[PDB]
Amino acid sequence: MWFEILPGIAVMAACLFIPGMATAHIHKFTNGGKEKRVAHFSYQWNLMERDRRISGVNRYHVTKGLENID
Amino acid sequence: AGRIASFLKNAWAKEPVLVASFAIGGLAIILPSLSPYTNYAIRINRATPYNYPVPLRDDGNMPDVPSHPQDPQGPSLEWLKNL
Amino acid sequence: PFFDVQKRLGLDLDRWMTIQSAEQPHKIPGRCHAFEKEWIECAHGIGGIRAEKECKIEFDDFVECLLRQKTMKRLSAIKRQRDKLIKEGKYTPPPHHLGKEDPRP
Amino acid sequence: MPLVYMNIIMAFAIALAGLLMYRSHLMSSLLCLEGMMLSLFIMSTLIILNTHFTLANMMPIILLVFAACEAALGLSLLVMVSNTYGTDYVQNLNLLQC
Amino acid sequence: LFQAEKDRRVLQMLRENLEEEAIIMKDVPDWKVGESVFHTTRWVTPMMGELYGLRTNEEILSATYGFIWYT
Amino acid sequence: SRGEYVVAKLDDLVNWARRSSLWPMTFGLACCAVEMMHMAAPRYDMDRFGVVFRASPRQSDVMIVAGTLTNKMAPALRKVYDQMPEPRYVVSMGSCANGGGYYHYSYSVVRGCDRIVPVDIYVPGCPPTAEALLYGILQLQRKIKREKRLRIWYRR
Amino acid sequence: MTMYIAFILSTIFVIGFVGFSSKPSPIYGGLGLIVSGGVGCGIVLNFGGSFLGLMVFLIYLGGMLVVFGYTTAMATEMYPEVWVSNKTVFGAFVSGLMMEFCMVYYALKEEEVEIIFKFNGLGDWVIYDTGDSGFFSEEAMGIAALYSYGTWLVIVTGWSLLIGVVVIMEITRGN
Amino acid sequence: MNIMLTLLTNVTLASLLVLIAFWLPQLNAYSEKTSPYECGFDPMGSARLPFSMKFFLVAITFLLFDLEIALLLPLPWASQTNNLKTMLTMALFLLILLAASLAYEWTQKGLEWAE
Amino acid sequence: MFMINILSLIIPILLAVAFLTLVERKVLGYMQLRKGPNVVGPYGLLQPIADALKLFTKEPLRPATSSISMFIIAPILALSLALTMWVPLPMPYPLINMNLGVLFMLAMSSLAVYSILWSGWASNSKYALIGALRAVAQTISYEVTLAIILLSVLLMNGSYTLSTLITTQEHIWMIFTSWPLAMMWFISTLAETNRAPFDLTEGESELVSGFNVEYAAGPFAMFFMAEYANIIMMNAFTAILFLGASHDPHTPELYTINFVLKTLALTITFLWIRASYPRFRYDQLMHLLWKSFLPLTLALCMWHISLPIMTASIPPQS
Ligand SMILES: CCCCCCCCCCCCCCCCC[C@@H](O)O[C@H](CO[C@H](O)CCCCCCCCCCCCCCC)COP(=O)(O)OCC[N+](C)(C)C
Ligand SMILES: CCCCCCCCCCCCCCCCC[C@@H](O)O[C@H](CO[C@H](O)CCCCCCCCCCCCCCC)COP(=O)(O)OCC[N+](C)(C)C
Ligand SMILES: CCCCCCCCCCCCCCCCC[C@@H](O)O[C@H](CO[C@H](O)CCCCCCCCCCCCCCC)COP(=O)(O)OCC[N+](C)(C)C
Ligand SMILES: CCCCCCCC/C=C\CCCCCCCC(=O)O[C@H](COC(=O)CCCCCCC/C=C/CCCCCCCC)COP(=O)(O)OCCN
Ligand SMILES: CCCCCCCC/C=C\CCCCCCCC(=O)O[C@H](COC(=O)CCCCCCC/C=C/CCCCCCCC)COP(=O)(O)OCCN
Ligand SMILES: CCCCCCCCCCC1=C(C)C(=O)C(OC)=C(OC)C1=O
Ligand code: SF4
């Protein structure tokens, strides 16, 4: 044997391993190394637009801390 | 008594699915009116601040209106923490 | 023809939905709340025949808010003149109107 | 008015003209009725969303409900017509004149 | 703070539009710069077309379809 | 030559794919089919070779004529053979399909299924054992492995 | 002006309406209505109506499916007609397409009052509201509000549905 | 924007698979191969002849029942109102009417297929 | 970069689908006291590749009586929708983050049924027509109960968003609170994907091949891919809905492994059920869904509306 079913099953597992993990990595890669912001409502979108506007680079994921208020 | 007992026994022996469906439906209909926690659910819904609380203009005649969030006046959710 | 049962019994069967300035959920306002409020307060109690005349300005403002025809006409005229000036080179759009604006929060 | 409003109104007009001009089958006329209902849904939804009439958001849903009833009604009638003639042709419905 | 910032941004965009329109519509004989289409003098919430009419396509797309298309 | 090597490798790949995935039609006539049922039984397990029965002639690759072909049935057998998409193969199983067998001199029996359709492999026996049919199927696999369509096309 | 996606979607909406309005075999009418429903769902989504567009699309699928079943049962012919298999159907289809083209061309090239009023175009984006507030969806709130606010609508709708069940069962009795 | 791209990619991949399927192999189509299938023989009648549906009443009822689901979809959002008593009453009323319609059709032999 | 994500979603699903066919064959063989594919490659690992290459190098034929446009369109619609169904599923991050993911999934499923209907009708054959009408009957049987079960389950989630299901099941799986509905839901998915004991659209022992009887080579392979992709998708949806895996935001791979294992277990359960039971009658299926599943579904919907109000456990995010 029955364990001879295990190889093929394992193969399928590896395939199903690829998508989700891939998405996670890509989100981090394109989002500055942190999870991509979720904007289900207009307030979150307004926050993201404000971060993009004040970044100075046109990237919402560039964060400005207390070092920018002189 | 005996008539409804025989009817319920026949229904349980023959259509248990319908008996379970009617039991669950009747419980769902009648139980919420007997529950003490429904008012708590209403209060929890009422206490969620979806929109901005617009301040009132002080006229010197509002003893029950706080002048700051941390003032003792106004609604308090000490009850919600312990729930 | 119209048996006003709601008014007689104070029932409010469907009056809550007739206008856009009537107690929306979560106090979410209509797009033209102020114009319609002004028109309704102007036209209240004086009858339809008189309201069609003495409250025409408020109704016109409400219709303009609803459909925005005159605003589109003004914008179209401004854009047409902008295109005409740009084509022959008399006017150049400023940097902040071409995507090089210094943005603000 | 935007061009989308004109396109939806023209869709309603096309569906009405298709319903009013009868070919052989009756199911086609019923489908034209469904299309008219869909166009009305789209128009009302667009207007309500644009105006931000919040309480009016439930209006299109109710519309759909009665659309179903209408559709169901039509289908019921079609069955009997077929059961009488074996076809859903409209030219068989000529026993009564003016 | 967001309300104050939004107010300032909208007013600044409106003033930029008004100044540019004053530049463009100078040759027109009977054109008033910044003339309202409403009889009432009270503040009217600006339309998206008024705010972003004389700007680029990308800004208009972001202002209109930015939130709806964000997934 | 480079093209010669390319067409040889492509022929190898296509032949391997076709012989490693053989789907015979669900089609039997008489006693021989019972032995075919025993070839799908756990002891021999034709599925372990990639051989899968399929009911639709459009989804089948092989036809195993397992039984006597009567005059009343010959049009139906030819019809379901013609509706098989190509490439397609035929295996003749048992004496009745090979040459008529025990009913050779009958008025109602086709004296061999090869009068109706071309046959690739002849499996003898009345009935052949499931092992004999498995040997015939593997021989058909080897015959498919020997196919050289793309080389012939390239040499045209 | 921006990518005119809504205009293209509405044009496909009209095209599907013409497709099922020329009245070919009801199979193709149902196909055209499915296309129109999906495209209208896309339009409503583009204007912010996710639930309504999804709901209408969801409602039509299955309703059409019931229709497909009914067409196979009582609305079939030996040679079902398509838009190119008949002179009447093809003529109606072509006339609808050309009327839509004429309406569009008279619309975007000039400001003329076709039936109700005139239009200039400039894309739908002009008529937006730039409202910036909320941790919720306005459409969701309105739909949710029917139980609390619309008690009368719920009552009449439920009564109508129950009576509709009774009515279909009454009609299909026969005898 | 992303959803349109995803749908376009899916449709394009499926169409390309169809093109590869129809253009790569060698096609030898003759009239006998492409004939309709009825397991050994020519079909007697057409497949476009009327095919009686014995569950037409349940099919019509599904249309109404389908409509009921749309009303029910808004319930999760609704459960967030302050007047929970009215919302609960309306939801229970709608479900009770749905159950009553089901019972009415069940008792009058409406769920039984035609003979 | 987003195109790379689309490809990284699409290709592994297809590869997984091909391997699932091999896994089904071997599991059925070992449940039937035999072995299954073990000759083509080590442990039969190369069998799906041989199957695909054989199918796509075989001639596809257009039936003489068929309607060619719908005949070609139907497999494309089936496979495209099967691929599209995977985009909102969070593992633990979705490719597309939708406010209403469950409703979009419901709508997509409805669209999938039409492909079976169109292929059966365009085949212009009697068995294909019987299979198409059986598909119509199946959808009528299961659709309403499936939607109401989904609504009842999601009443505890607070929203239709798929990712919120990860938050709702942070401490216990949802099945512990909705194990009755779950069982019904499971059966519905069996009816929905046309899987045994509800494989009535194909019906090999009755309708030869059912709706896809005239299809051959590539279009048939595409229908097979769509069916198996839908199987894996529905098992993944059930795993997300009822078996909530713990998610650590700094290590999503743990959630990915947990989710994949749960989906694999559910798919193997599907194969087990196919190997265990006979076939229903397509009127018996409708009678089961309407006379047994629907009263219980309505009663449990009433119960699950009342339960959060009774116990003051209404979920957030109106
Ligand atoms: C990339 C996506 C598009 C293309 C899709 C195709 C995917 C790639 C194809 C995968 C190739 C793997 C197949 C090779 C398996 C061979 C196994 C080996 O055993 O074969 C032997 C010898 O091999 C064969 O002679 C030839 C197979 C090798 C094919 C040549 C390589 C060509 C690859 C080119 C790839 C290009 C793909 C098309 C892209 C456009 C003969 O053994 P066999 O008789 O069976 O077994 C006897 C059984 N016993 C042992 C129990 C007694
Ligand atoms: C005069 C004779 C009367 C009897 C016969 C009349 C036939 C008509 C059917 C029923 C009469 C209509 C009366 C119902 C009006 C609905 C509105 C009213 O009831 O108020 C509601 C009170 O809710 C009650 O619970 C209504 C329940 C009564 C209806 C349920 C059963 C009765 C209908 C039965 C007949 C229908 C067909 C038969 C089906 C079996 C909502 O109030 P509330 O939510 O606080 O505040 C709303 C304001 N907010 C939004 C700002 C907060
Ligand atoms: C899975 C995702 C990845 C897939 C990626 C690949 C996608 C490919 C799409 C499908 C193509 C592959 C299928 C097979 C190869 C194509 C050959 C055929 O389809 O085209 C031939 C093209 O022939 C044309 O009719 C005439 C040839 C001349 C074309 C004129 C174009 C201008 C060229 C003039 C010379 C100048 C060069 C300019 C080019 C840059 C027609 O031959 P035909 O017999 O029907 O088909 C039978 C094929 N058989 C034999 C293998 C079974
Ligand atoms: C009060 C709660 C109500 C609201 C919740 C209800 C939820 C949904 C339930 C109602 C759905 C509709 C049910 C309709 C019942 C019709 C029964 C019927 O007519 O079918 C009979 C079978 O049923 C009967 O015998 C008649 C009714 C018998 C009793 C059924 C249950 C009635 C109530 C019993 C439970 C009472 C309350 C529970 C108490 C539990 C004990 C403490 C015939 O069966 P066939 O399918 O035709 O047979 C074909 C094979 N030869
Ligand atoms: C304190 C408050 C609590 C509220 C009450 C909650 C308690 C509820 C108690 C009862 C719940 C039971 C729910 C069961 C759902 C319906 C069961 C049923 O009755 O259906 C059967 C039929 O059900 C089946 O047979 C299923 C058919 C298909 C089976 C294929 C799979 C078999 C099982 C595989 C494993 C299942 C795994 C489930 C969970 C999976 C993980 C998600 C009816 O068939 P008949 O005997 O013919 O009756 C009709 C005449 N009266
Ligand atoms: C998948 C399990 C093994 C399948 C075997 C398929 C055999 C197909 C031959 C048809 C047939 C059947 C069904 C059959 O039952 C039978 O016995 C009377 C025959 O005569 C021997 C047959 O020819
Ligand atoms: S060859 Fe022998 S065993 Fe086979 S069918 Fe003929 S008589 Fe029966």
Secondary structure percentages of chain B, helix, strand, coil, to 5: 55, 0, 45
Q: Output the CA I292–ligand 4 centroid distance in Å.
A: 10
CA–CA–CA angle I31, I33, I35 (5° rounding):
90
Please tell me the CATH code under which domain D3-85 is placed: 1.10.287.3510
* F17 membership: H or E segment, kind and range: helix F2-20
Determination approach: cryo-EM
For residue C68, the tally of other CB atoms under 10 A from its CB is: 20
Q: Which amino acid is at I188?
A: S
Helices I101-122 and G50-74: angle between axes, nearest 10 degrees: 20
The whole domain housing H92 covers 1-108
Comparing C-alpha atoms, which of I98, I107, I93, I111 is closest to residue I240? I93
Handedness of CA I30, I36, I38, I39 (dihedral sign): positive
H helices present in C16-104, as ranges: 33-43, 48-54, 56-67, 69-88
Instruction: Categorise residue C26: left if φ over 0, alpha if ψ from -120 to 50, beta otherwise.
Output: left
Half-sphere exposure of I97 (CA within 13 A, CB side): 17
Helix (H/G/I), strand (E/B), else coil: D89: strand
Interchain CB contact of E25 with C (< 8 Å) = yes
Copy the structure tokens of residue I146.
């499936």
Q: In this complex, do I296 and B20 lie within 8 Å of one another by their Cβ atoms?
A: yes
Domain chopping of chain D, boundaries? 3-85
Q: In this complex, do C24 and D54 lie within 8 Å of one another by their Cβ atoms?
A: yes
Q: Which of H86, H95, H98 to mutate to test the pocket of ligand 2 (most atoms within 8 A of CB)?
A: H86
The Cα-based distances of I314 to B45, F7, F105, H78, I19 in angstroms read: 8, 68, 85, 11, 43
All residues at 6 or more sequence positions from I167 whose CB lies less than 8 Å from its CB, including other chains: none
Copy the structure tokens of residue G90.
């093809």
H helices present in chain G, as ranges: 5-21, 26-46, 50-74, 87-108, 138-149, 151-171
The whole domain housing F7 covers 2-155
Residues in chain E, total: 71
Comparing C-alpha atoms, which of D1, C103, D28 is closest to residue G89? D28
Q: Which amino acid is at G167?
A: V
**How does DSSP classify residue A66?**
G
Question: Which residues are bridge partners to F92 per DSSP?
Answer: F65, F122
Ligand 5 pocket member I160 (CB < 6 A): no
What is the number of structural domains in chain H?
1
All residues at 6 or more sequence positions from C77 whose CB lies less than 8 Å from its CB, including other chains: none
Copy the structure tokens of residue G117.
């009023």
Copy the structure tokens of residue G107.
């619309």
List the CATH number of the domain containing H39: 1.20.58.1610
Question: Which residues are bridge partners to F54 per DSSP?
Answer: F25
Comparing C-alpha atoms, which of E22, D35, I178, H48 is closest to residue G76? H48
Copy the structure tokens of residue C1.
């023809």
Comparing C-alpha atoms, which of I277, I230, I263 is closest to residue I111? I230
Helix (H/G/I), strand (E/B), else coil: F146: coil
- In this complex, the residue of G1, G46, G127 whose CB is nearest that of residue E60 is G1
- In this complex, the residue of D61, D72, D86 whose CB is nearest that of residue H63 is D72
**How does DSSP classify residue F71?**
T
Q: In this complex, do I111 and G61 lie within 8 Å of one another by their Cβ atoms?
A: yes
Spell out the domains of chain G, with CATH numbers in brackets: 5-172 (1.20.120.1200)
Copy the structure tokens of residue G130.
């730039």
Check: CB of residue G46 under 8 Å from CB of residue G53.
Answer: no
Smallest CA–CA distance from I93 into chain E, residue: E71
Give exposure, I135-145, as e/b (b: 16+ Cβ within 10 Å).
Answer: bbbbbbbbbbb
Residue D59 CA to residue H85 CA, distance in Å, equals: 23
Check: CB of residue H83 under 8 Å from CB of residue I312.
Answer: no
Copy the structure tokens of residue D51.
């105006």
Residue G27 CA to residue I74 CA, distance in Å, equals: 14
Ligand 4 pocket member I299 (CB < 6 A): yes
What's the CA dihedral at I284, I290, I296, I297 to 10 degrees? 120
Q: Output the CA I147–ligand 1 centroid distance in Å.
A: 47
Q: Is position H115 within any domain?
A: no
Residue H73 CA to residue I150 CA, distance in Å, equals: 10
What's the CA dihedral at I210, I213, I216, I220 to 10 degrees? -10
Given in angstroms, what resolution was this structure solved at? 2.9
Burial grade of C15 (CB within 10 A; 0-12, 13-18, 19 or more): exposed
Residue H49 CA to residue G25 CA, distance in Å, equals: 14
Which residues of chain H have a CB within 8 Å of the CB of F84? 33
Ligand 5 pocket member I180 (CB < 6 A): yes
Residue F114 CA to residue F119 CA, distance in Å, equals: 6
How far is residue I129 CA from its own chain's centroid?
A: 23
Copy the structure tokens of residue A22.
């891939």
Give exposure, G29-61, as e/b (b: 16+ Cβ within 10 Å).
Answer: bbbbbbbbbbbbbbbbbbbbbbbbbbbbbbbbb
Copy the structure tokens of residue F103.
């009913």
Copy the structure tokens of residue I143.
């659709």
**How does DSSP classify residue D13?**
H
Check: CB of residue C30 under 8 Å from CB of residue G138.
Answer: no
Ligand 3 pocket member H19 (CB < 6 A): yes
When computed from its CA atoms, the radius of gyration of chain A, rounded to whole angstroms, is 20
Question: Which residues are bridge partners to D66 per DSSP?
Answer: none
Q: Which of G141, G154, G155, G166 to mutate to test the pocket of ligand 2 (most atoms within 8 A of CB)?
A: G155
Contact partners for chain G, using 3 or more CB pairs closer than 8 A, are A, B, C, D, E, H, I
For residue A17, the tally of other CB atoms under 10 A from its CB is: 18
Tell me phi and psi for residue A67, to 5 degrees.
Answer: -75, -5
The Cα of B62 is separated from the nearest Cα of chain I by a number of Å equal to 33
Closest ligand 6 atom to F40 CA: 3
Residue I45 CA to residue I19 CA, distance in Å, equals: 8
Ligand 5 pocket member I289 (CB < 6 A): no
Check: CB of residue B6 under 8 Å from CB of residue I274.
Answer: no
Check: CB of residue G13 under 8 Å from CB of residue G44.
Answer: no
Ligand 2 pocket member G152 (CB < 6 A): yes
Give exposure, F28-40, as e/b (b: 16+ Cβ within 10 Å).
Answer: bbbebbebbebbb
Give exposure, I89-114, as e/b (b: 16+ Cβ within 10 Å).
Answer: bbbbbbbbbbbbbbbbbbbbbbbbbb
* Edge-to-edge strands, sheet with F121-123: F62-66, F89-93, F121-123
For chain B, give the longest Cα–Cα distance.
Answer: 74
Helix (H/G/I), strand (E/B), else coil: F43: coil
List the CATH number of the domain containing F115: 3.40.50.12280
Q: How many helices and strands in chain H, by DSSP H and E?
A: 4, 0
Check: CB of residue I195 under 8 Å from CB of residue I270.
Answer: yes
Residue F55 CA to residue I205 CA, distance in Å, equals: 9
Q: In this complex, do H2 and E65 lie within 8 Å of one another by their Cβ atoms?
A: no
Check: CB of residue C91 under 8 Å from CB of residue C82.
Answer: yes
Tell me phi and psi for residue F68, to 5 degrees.
Answer: -85, 135
Copy the structure tokens of residue G106.
């008279």
Comparing C-alpha atoms, which of G46, D45, G137, E69 is closest to residue I159? G137
Copy the structure tokens of residue H100.
């009553």
Q: Is position H75 within any domain?
A: yes
Half-sphere exposure of G78 (CA within 13 A, CB side): 2
Residue A66 CA to residue G133 CA, distance in Å, equals: 26
Comparing C-alpha atoms, which of F1, B38, G59, G30 is closest to residue H86? B38
Give a three-class secondary structure readout of chain I.
CHHHHHHHHHHHHHHHHHHHHHHHHHHHHHHCCCCCCCCCCHHHCCHHHHHHHHHHCCCCCCCCCCCHHHHHHHHHHHHHHHHHCCCCCCCCCCCCCCCCHHHHHHHHHHHHHHHHHHHHHHCCCHHHHHHHHHHHHHHHHHHHHHHHHHHHHHCCCCCCCCCHHHHHCCCCCHHHCCHHHHHHHHHHHHHHCCCCCCCCCCCHHHHCCHHHCCCCCHHHHHHHHHHHHHHHHHHHHHHHHHCCCCCECCEHHHHHHHHHHHHHHHHHHHHHHHHHCCCCCHHHHHHHHHHHHHHHHHHHHHHHHHHHHHHCCCCCCC
Residue D20 CA to residue D27 CA, distance in Å, equals: 13
Which residues of chain G have a CB within 8 Å of the CB of D4? 6-7, 10, 43, 124
Copy the structure tokens of residue I207.
């309708």
Q: Output the CA G147–ligand 2 centroid distance in Å.
A: 11
Copy the structure tokens of residue B30.
């009648």
Tell me phi and psi for residue I260, to 5 degrees.
Answer: -65, -40
Residue E48 CA to residue E59 CA, distance in Å, equals: 11
Tell me phi and psi for residue I312, to 5 degrees.
Answer: 55, 50
Is the bond preceding residue B16 a cis peptide, omega within 30 degrees?
A: no
Q: What DSSP string describes F73-122?
A: THHHHHHHHHTSPSS-EEEEEHHHHHH-GGGTT-SSB-S-GGGTS--SEE
Check: CB of residue G131 under 8 Å from CB of residue E63.
Answer: no
Helix (H/G/I), strand (E/B), else coil: G1: coil
How far is residue F154 CA from its own chain's centroid?
A: 28
Ligand 5 pocket member B12 (CB < 6 A): no
Q: Which amino acid is at C26?
A: H
Q: In this complex, do D2 and G123 lie within 8 Å of one another by their Cβ atoms?
A: yes
Residue E50 CA to residue G129 CA, distance in Å, equals: 11
CA–CA–CA angle C71, C77, C83 (5° rounding):
135
Tell me phi and psi for residue A32, to 5 degrees.
Answer: 80, 20
Residue B19 CA to residue H73 CA, distance in Å, equals: 27
Q: What DSSP string describes H40-82?
A: SS--SS-TTS----TTHHHHHHHHHHHHHHHHHTTHHHHTTSS
